[PDB]
Design a protein around this ligand. Structure first.
Ligand SMILES: CCN1CCN(C(=O)c2ccc(Cn3nc(C)cc3C)cc2)CC1
Length: 120
């Protein structure tokens, strides 16, 4: 019933949460995730945020094309040809970022667990 849903889920290697989809309930409190960057991983429910999109006014981390990142705040959403863009405000200035360029630090993801988390 969670299969096919979009999530933002913790990748254990760096502790950031990345965009992906639940592809399977694999039991033992874990789901098979397909991350948008092509990584298939089994992830604990407690590490999966069922938010699609990440809400307005959330503090997030956004990547540029050259892999530079910094914190910002979600100030908008836009759908184009089935794809989602986020308007992220950094130092008072906004740019549009594709879904998979918006990630959460461990602290930023932790903040959404109570409302959007799976498992416990
Ligand atoms: C979801 C799976 N996918 C898998 C591919 N990814 C990476 O190989 C990856 C690993 C480390 C970094 C560097 N970084 N960036 C931040 C921020 C924090 C840290 C330590 C960057 C990228 C990204 C994640």
């Amino acid at each position: 019933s969670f299969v096919g849903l979009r999530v933002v889920a913790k990748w254990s290697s760096n502790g950031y949460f990345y965009s992906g989809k639940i592809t399977r309930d694999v039991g033992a409190g874990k789901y098979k995730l397909l991350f948008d960057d092509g990584y298939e991983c089994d992830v604990l429910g407690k590490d999966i945020l069922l938010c699609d999109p990440i809400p307005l006014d959330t503090e997030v981390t956004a990547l540029s094309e050259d892999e530079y990142f910094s914190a910002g705040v979600v100030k908008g959403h836009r759908k184009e040809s089935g794809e989602l863009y986020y308007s992220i405000e950094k130092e008072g200035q906004r740019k549009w970022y594709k879904r998979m360029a918006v990630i959460l630090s461990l602290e930023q993801g932790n903040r959404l667990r109570e409302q959007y988390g799976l498992g416990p």
